[PDB]
Amino acid sequence: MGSVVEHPEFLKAGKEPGLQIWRVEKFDLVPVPTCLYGDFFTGDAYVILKTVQLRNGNLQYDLHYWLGNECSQDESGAAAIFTVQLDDYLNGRAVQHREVQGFESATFLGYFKSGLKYKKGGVASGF
Amino acid sequence: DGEDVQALVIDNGSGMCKAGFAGDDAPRAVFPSIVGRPRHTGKDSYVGDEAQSKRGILTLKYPIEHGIVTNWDDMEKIWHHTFYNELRVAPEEHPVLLTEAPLNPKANREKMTQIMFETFNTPAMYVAIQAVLSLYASGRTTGIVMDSGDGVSHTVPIYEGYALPHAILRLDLAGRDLTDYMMKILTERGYSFTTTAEREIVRDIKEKLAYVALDFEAEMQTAASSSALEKSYELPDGQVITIGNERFRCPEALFQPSFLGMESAGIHETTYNSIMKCDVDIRKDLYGNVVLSGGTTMFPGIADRMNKELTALAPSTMKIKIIAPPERKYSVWIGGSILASLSTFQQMWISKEEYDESGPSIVHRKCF
Numbered sequence: 001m002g003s004v005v006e007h008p009e010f011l012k013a014g015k016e017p018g019l020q021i022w023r024v025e026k027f028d029l030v031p032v033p034t035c036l037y038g039d040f041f042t043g044d045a046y047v048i049l050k051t052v053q054l055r056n057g058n059l060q061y062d063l064h065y066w067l068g069n070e071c072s073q074d075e076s077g078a079a080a081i082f083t084v085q086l087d088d089y090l091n092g093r094a095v096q097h098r099e100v101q102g103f104e105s106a107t108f109l110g111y112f113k114s115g116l117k118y119k120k121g122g123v124a125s126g127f
Numbered sequence: 128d129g130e131d132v133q134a135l136v137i138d139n140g141s142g143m144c145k146a147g148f149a150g151d152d153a154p155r156a157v158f159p160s161i162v163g164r165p166r167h168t169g170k171d172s173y174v175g176d177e178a179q180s181k182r183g184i185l186t187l188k189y190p191i192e193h194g195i196v197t198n199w200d201d202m203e204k205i206w207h208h209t210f211y212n213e214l215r216v217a218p219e220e221h222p223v224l225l226t227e228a229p230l231n232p233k234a235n236r237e238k239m240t241q242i243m244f245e246t247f248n249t250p251a252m253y254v255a256i257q258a259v260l261s262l263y264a265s266g267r268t269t270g271i272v273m274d275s276g277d278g279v280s281h282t283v284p285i286y287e288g289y290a291l292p293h294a295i296l297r298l299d300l301a302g303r304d305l306t307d308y309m310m311k312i313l314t315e316r317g318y319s320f321t322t323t324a325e326r327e328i329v330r331d332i333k334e335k336l337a338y339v340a341l342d343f344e345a346e347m348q349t350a351a352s353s354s355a356l357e358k359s360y361e362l363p364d365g366q367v368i369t370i371g372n373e374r375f376r377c378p379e380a381l382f383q384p385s386f387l388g389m390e391s392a393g394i395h396e397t398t399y400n401s402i403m404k405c406d407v408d409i410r411k412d413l414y415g416n417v418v419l420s421g422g423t424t425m426f427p428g429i430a431d432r433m434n435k436e437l438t439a440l441a442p443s444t445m446k447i448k449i450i451a452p453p454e455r456k457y458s459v460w461i462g463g464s465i466l467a468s469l470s471t472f473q474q475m476w477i478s479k480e481e482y483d484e485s486g487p488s489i490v491h492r493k494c495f
């Protein structure tokens with residue numbers, strides 16, 4: 001009696017307006033170094049949280065899970081699940097979005113002011 | 128097998144049990160969900176293939192009917208065999224993830240939890256809905272799963288990670304029904320398939336040579352005027368039979384239940400009915416994410432036909448996408464494997480400590 005994620009990254013999520021990016025790495029949610037935001041490994045899957053400030057003092061949340069053309073099944077399945085868990089942790093307030101390489105929504109592309117970039121490779125599968 | 132604590136994944140079906148280790152990409156064991164007991168004497172019992180081979184002196188039973196457990200002692204045998212014979216582990220040493228059907232009765236969810244902790248002493252367990260695990264395996268959180276196995280088919284709309292119970296539809300029409308039907312129409316062709324041993328043969332004809340026609344009437348035609356669609360099949364004895372339009376009429380029963388003397392809607396219209404029961408605002412996301420899952424979705428041509436039939440039911444501008452992964456026979460199991468492997472899952476299990484405090488009803492608060 002409860003089912004609360006104690007993952008350090010959940011505690012940091014959505015605290016303030018901005019962009020947070022994590023990479024699925026062997027069944028774990030791992031932060032991307034902020035100097036690397038926007039360079040996506042096509043062999044990987046990622047989870048992005050866009051926090052917008054509302055008048056009300058509260059934050060608006062858009063959760064995006066990005067799937068690279070060569071990411072393995074464990075990675076895309078984990079990005080999806082991590083998205084569900086983060087939304088839940090945030091009281092169901094995030095709006096979820098599936099982003100596929102080459103077909104991303106305009107809003108998502110719009111988060112990367114110097115233009116999102118794709119790069120081959122990535123971390124090995126957790127299987 | 129075992130990272131730190133090695134979790135196990137059990138996917139129990141009406142016809143087959145799929146079991147393995149969290150973190151593998153596939154089930155280690157796949158065996159028939161059958162329990163055989165002596166017709167007269169030795170208490171004693173057999174499971175799976177072995178029960179089948181000694182059927183002549185055993186009473187065989189299926190503990191899961193239409194995805195729901197109807198015999199708990201036999202279910203416990205399936206489980207004991209799974210751990211000791213198939214995976215070769217001591218259950219008291221591992222967290223176990225189990226799967227369940229959509230709308231599983233409350234009492235059944237309690238009983239699974241009870242057996243795990245009290246009969247097998249698992250240190251931890253979790254129950255997950257099969258359809259939701261397939262959606263996860265396909266890297267999605269919203270979509271509609273059409274899950275069809277040996278005893279039941281379900282259409283399960285899911286949004287942002289959770290099933291929408293009110294819109295789930297069940298169809299007691301699945302693989303077994305299809306096998307039986309292939310028996311009856313192969314018989315009508317001039318052959319004779321009516322025995323238990325023959326059923327097995329037919330199941331195999333169904334799995335190797337059946338297919339879904341894109342256009343049923345055009346195909347009946349091609350079949351009637353040409354010999355082009357025919358195929359030969361070798362029975363265990365060396366005799367060769369010829370299968371014709373039976374190849375596609377068998378699975379046609381999925382789209383036309385009247386062929387089995389059933390009054391219900393076929394899988395395409397059931398999928399459509401589930402979508403129309405959901406909020407108009409998520410329908411676009413359901414139609415564009417129709418995930419097929421289960422062994423009965425393995426017929427060649429089924430995706431193309433589901434695409435055609437749904438495209439005809441929905442407004443022409445609606446974008447339809449049928450997703451039918453090559454591994455869909457094991458999608459449920461793979462989803463379970465991924466979920467149980469997550470660093471953030473540790474917290475989701477029901478621990479022995481929770482069970483000793485609340486008893487079996489803890490399952491309604493911990494697993495939704």
Ligand SMILES: Nc1ncnc2c1ncn2[C@@H]1O[C@H](COP(=O)(O)OP(=O)(O)OP(=O)(O)O)[C@@H](O)[C@H]1O
Pocket residue numbers: 139140141142143144193194275276277278279280301302303330333334335421422423424425426456
């Ligand atoms: N290649 C195939 N083509 C058609 N049907 C197949 C194929 N392979 C397997 N099946 C059928 O799929 C069924 C078993 O699939 P599955 O393991 O998903 O069902 P289950 O989990 O045991 O049943 P249920 O989900 O109804 O409880 C059987 O009816 C089997 O004959």
Ligand SMILES: [Ca+2]
Pocket residue numbers: 043044045070071072075121122123124125
């Ligand atoms: Ca990768």
Ligand SMILES: [Ca+2]
Pocket residue numbers: 087092093094095096287
């Ligand atoms: Ca939400």
Ligand SMILES: [Ca+2]
Pocket residue numbers: 139140141257276421459
């Ligand atoms: Ca099943």
